[PDB]
């Protein structure tokens, strides 16, 4: 776990390799979990068919992970501004686009871009403003 | 031996792995009846003569037997060869050894030492299970009443379901 | 005859248990100094 | 009611006994001269050791010695 | 049911939650849960229709394994602390088990599959008990142990439930299952504030009970398990159309009605505790719940669906009345909001 | 131990006697050789709900010697009775009847 | 004990995996379900016995008494199912979809 | 190092006679050698440590050997015939060797002036006076924490009323 | 608990037997009866939030009266040491291991 | 010399059982006015060796059984337990001393049920499955009446130790305090052997029972285990109800008088076989569920009071 966290430790826009690798893993992990629920429920017809679906979901998710990581890191590199929700949005923007392609739908890319990017941007803001998620009870 | 309990514990896991591969309804009943025998033995190891025998008396022949009974009446359609299951089961027999092995090298360990009967009065009586179970009638008489209602309303629950 | 007899088995137990009461001191004394002789003697084998 | 018991004693002569001894055993303890002793004969048994209390001189009853006239003397359990 | 059996069962279904709540020895809390499991199964199969046996056999297996997991937590604690009850020291995994298990008996989040299906095959009446007098027991166990449970998991089960409940409800047209889905959702809010302010869980429950109990006795007054069936309410009994309208919008969070308070104070407590991430997402999809509530509103009240000719025959005959509880629980529920300060 | 030896010897004797049985001897269709007994199942769980009954009645031998003897008596009688009333309901239910 | 207590716990998890991965006959499940109660009964009895905690021995049995009835209910549902379908396969229990 | 007495210290002449003879001469061992045995217990239950009452322990291991030493000179032969039958049983019951008992009791009623106790005269809790200072803080209990302080006073209607949302209450 | 019908009614059907130091039958104290006492008379009047930091000495001890694991690590280590030395004969089975040494009452 | 004990504990019961096969054929005979075996030996003393040395030589035909594993584990379970319930038997000196002895005898006795279940199920046949289900019903139903008789009686000797029953009987037989228990015990020992007026299983006129598909060895064992606990459940009555003499000295007298009463109770079952038409399966149950079980539960309640009001609570140990 010390791993994933590393993504945040190094300043954004720097060491994109690590960023892309980490982001790709998270997506892939989600892919596995997502495929699992998708196979446990709404099962397949043959073991192979399901192994394929696991692969499909895993790769698609890994891809959205990569492009998000790559775009955000590079956008920051090229733009030279490390702290900017916009970097992430461009990244989320891209991530959605990959999802759209994998699903072969321009429309999905639309919602995907907006919704996904917005979400990622909010993550950046969240980190920048020190928003706390799942907080301990401090009442 | 000193590994009097471990070995047994290992057999208990084997029987549970057999029930877990969900073998034919009655072939596995045997499996339970086996690990119930095994669990009966371990408790005896620690001095729980009563508590132990109790299991051999109620879950073994009372609950389990009734279970298979019903299997015969239904769900013993006896339409995967359990032998395939035995094949897998054999895999687990040693696959569990793998799980233990990692911690085996990691090592408590070296069988089982004084990891049983931690403290026993080298003098004295009345120290024996069944004195504790008989607290149902002195100082723990609420567990006794609620168990009653379980069995008592059990009658009424079963018939109502059956009807 | 089961009234009058099982009463006696009680009175024999009291006779038999009070014997045990008189010898807790000797045993508990031996048991203290014995186990208190094991682990100085094991403290040594660990330390000596 | 009293002559209904007469066929239930001729035919069905089992449940009669089972509801005549089920109960008899609930009234024998409440009405017997000797039921007091069961919680007393069972209270005298010294299974564990009687720990002696330190003397202060403020305790007259506590029998100093096992053979003092004082203390729980059961000349009852004997010839109960 | 031989009225004697009815008594024994009903007593158990009622001694079941009560032992749980009263006792502190967890064991005694477990058997309280066990009784409830045994008592509910007979009533579930009263019609003994083929759907029913399916319902009970699912409810029972889901309930039984969860009961066994709760017992394992108590058994493990017994060895990590001699006590028969969770304490500050309790291993975190020990408590998480209890959360998952108890979240299965209550049917929250990723274990929300059994409830909609058992709510579909049981009568409307036993539906209420299965939804509201069987949630009191497990929740009691959680509320007691709140200081020790994890804020992260609860929140995830909370948010998930809200979403699953909402999304599930949108598609459903069977009423029994629309309610099952709502209960999953409301149950979610309840478990969200447990780690922070248990006292509010007990409000978000009562209000749910004071809202759902009138709503179901409404569904059964005409025994309609279909929206199409409840839509012809205007012909069968016109008066309940007004309150059915407000109670369902009350079940969702719309502001003038009593239903806003539970969501409002839960949001106030979560923001007080800084979960302005979590609270926001919950409130937003909470709005999805009202969409399916209002879609039903449309069919039952705001628009008059066409009825069959035989409906005139049922009008003729005097309609067996709805118990008084409906009224007292419809009003105390649709409009108590002006009295919120004292409720909390 | 001794108990182990015995129970184990008792097994070996059993096995040998079937060993000899299948080997001493050393086709023809010689080998060639149902509805639910709801009554039976009932009888079976009647026995389960009663065997557990015994398991809660076995402490009597060690509870008779409890100080609160009056309490034991009371606690027991209720158990035996509530279980008899159950059987009795079965009787009326005719579940006992075969 | 610490070593053994593990085996029993994994026995309960192996029994857990069993009841959470059905396959055909239900009677198998209920049977598995019982495998847990045995593992819980054994573990409760074991620790109570090596803690010399006699005040708690009541529990090891209360666990069994409640578990037995629990199973009684479970089997009556099972008999009810192979009376309505006569094959007791978890497979046909899908009308509620 | 946890204090553990020197083995040399623990050395004490010992009883070394099988359980049977102890069971025979026990009821007289409760009459005699009681002040020296109860004070051990009174240390043992008060001072919960076998590393502190070893003093009175050596006394118990002493008075007992005294008890028998008299019996060995006085009235030894009838004592040998007593436990020699009593040890034949599998639980060493007095119920069998009942004739050997009076023959040893009259031999010891006359000589040494001992009288065997009545039935219930070893189950009473005698009060033994001793000098061992009371073992305070037994269990070596580290000082306890203080109770949370107590807010004090009397209730006064709440300030400005329920401070809810615009409910002027 | 959630509804304290027990304290109110004064009955104690469920409290008398919740900890190892509760009344054990025939007054046969369990293992650790000493500690748990010391760890609950400490945390009495002090709520949990403060029964978890300052009353940590008594739980750290009671967590080792019952688990008794730190001991294992000691003993297990000791065991290994003996083994290595013994293999090179550095250490010899003690007189105790040789038996005798005057096993006494 | 512990092994000398087993060798002198199992040989003298497999050699006794063998001559119960004989004695169950002669005593039944002379009641039927027909001499039993007279020829192979002097007076039939050498007949069981013949069909012992004969059955084992007949083909143990595994007849298309579903599972040998069971077909060959059931018959062994039986003789394994039956010859084990003898290990804790309370002679003046029992092979092994077992507190919880009477429970041991109860528990092990129960396991036997499986033999019926397993054997019936494995051997694929209507008769086999039919008989088994019906047979165990009986066996199980009679355990619940045995246990209580067993429990009730315990309150009187006050422990689960067989070896104390002898002391409790140091001056009287428990037959006189509890003849009602001893009646229902006799039927619960006579009908839990699937024996006597009660042979529903192995119904021969109606059912051809479970052991039907068994032959040669597999059968012999099942049989050997019905006559080696035809002597137990009479040997217990000669311990629990009929208390022979026990003197610290002369420790044989007990065994000798144990003989004299165990043969009667083993010869009393033989009058039954030759005297009573078989109960019908429904009646057997109604004998236990609606007649014996009621009386048994009430008398159990009576015996928990008798100690308290007579202040006769027996001495633990
Ligand atoms: C109606 O049911 C019945 C039958 O089946 C139809 C019978 O055949 C029979 C007749 C059967 C017999 C005469 C006995 C069958 C064979 C036997 C003698 C079994 C005993 C065999 C033995 C090996 C005993 C010898 C013992 C040792 C191992 C030696 C120890 C040293 C009866 C009585 C019966 O009840
Ligand atoms: C004292 C009481 C208890 C006694 C228990 C022990 C009793 C037995 C004592 C020793 C007996 C030793 C011989 C047993 C029978 C051996 C097999 C036999 O006779 O031949 C049949 C066997 C098999 O018969 P088969 O080959 O003719 O085939 C018969 C037809 N079918 C195929 C359908 C079975 O013949 C042989 O193969 C040769 C056997 C030689 C045995 C060694 C000499
Ligand atoms: C300089 C101008 C730059 C404009 C950039 C944004 C628009 C770029 C459009 C590129 C072409 C996209 C396209 O053609 O696909 C439309 C998309 C899918 O349409 P579909 O029905 O799948 O058929 C497509 C068949 N080729 O259907 C969609 O989902 C489109 C989603 C994106 C819409 C972009 C324009 C939105 C305008 C909103 C105005 C609000 C005021
Ligand atoms: C609040 C206001 C938000 C306003 C956002 C406006 C975005 C408008 C974008 C242009 C319109 C696109 C559109 O409406 O398409 C709907 C789309 C049609 O279907 P299609 O794209 O062919 O794929 C079907 C997949 N089941 O239907 C779908 O594809 C639905 C499935 C794809 C969902 C894409 C969005 C996923 C967002 C993930 C966020 C993760 C964080
Ligand atoms: C991230 C978290 C991942 C958690 C695991 C997810 C696993 C994938 C879930 C979806 C799998 C795809 C759906 C189909 C799965 C399936 O069919 O297997 C069920 C299994 C086999 O039994 P059956 O139901 O008859 O299936 C036969 C199919 N021809 O039924 C059973 O296996 C019953 C239980 C027997 C096997 C387990 C027994 C316990 C011992 C396990 C040892 C390790 C086994 C590893 C495999
Ligand atoms: C905060 C404000 C919240 C909103 C308040 C205003 C909306 C109230 C809720 C209305 C919800 C239902 C809307 C649709 C109703 C349809 C009614 C209908 O179809 O008519 C039949 C119905 C029953 O008929 P029946 O009375 O039996 O006799 C006539 C038979 N045809 O006829 C009837 O039902 C008659 C009785 C209807 C109920 C009367 C309610 C009057 C309006 C209440 C306003 C309250 C304002 C509070 C302001 C608070 C400010 C702080
Ligand atoms: C393939 C053919 C079929 C194979 C299976 C056949 C059936 C096998 C079972 C036959 C019946 C066995 C019944 C055993 C019940 C339990 C016995 C018991 O609990 O007592 C053991 C006893 C307990 O201690 P306690 O009562 O205090 O002893 C008196 C002095 N204190 O003292 C002891 O603890 C002694 C040590 C434990 C012995 C328990 C029984 C062990 C049985 C081992 C069978 C395998 C033999 C070795 C392989
Ligand atoms: C507390 C009780 C502890 C012991 C409980 C024992 C079980 C109690 C069972 C009660 C049964 C009630 C019942 O339903 O009996 C029905 C019975 C006829 O049923 P059945 O036996 O099937 O008839 C077929 C005949 N071939 O017909 C009957 O009811 C006959 C009842 C006869 C006895 C009634 C009560 C008599 C009490 C006498 C007390 C002393 C009087 C002097």
From TrEMBL, chain A:
It is a multi-pass membrane protein. Disulfide bonds join 16-73, 93-113. Its main location: mitochondrion. It comes from the Eukaryota. GO terms for cellular component: mitochondrial inner membrane; respiratory chain complex I. One of its GO terms (biological process) is mitochondrial electron transport, NADH to ubiquinone. Keywords: Membrane, Mitochondrion, Mitochondrion inner membrane, Transmembrane, Transmembrane helix. Pfam families: Tim17. It is found in: Mitochondrion inner membrane. Complex I is composed of 45 different subunits. Belongs to the complex I NDUFA11 subunit family. Accessory subunit of the mitochondrial membrane respiratory chain NADH dehydrogenase (Complex I), that is believed not to be involved in catalysis. Complex I functions in the transfer of electrons from NADH to the respiratory chain. The immediate electron acceptor for the enzyme is believed to be ubiquinone. This is NADH dehydrogenase [ubiquinone] 1 alpha subcomplex subunit 11. It comes from Mus musculus.
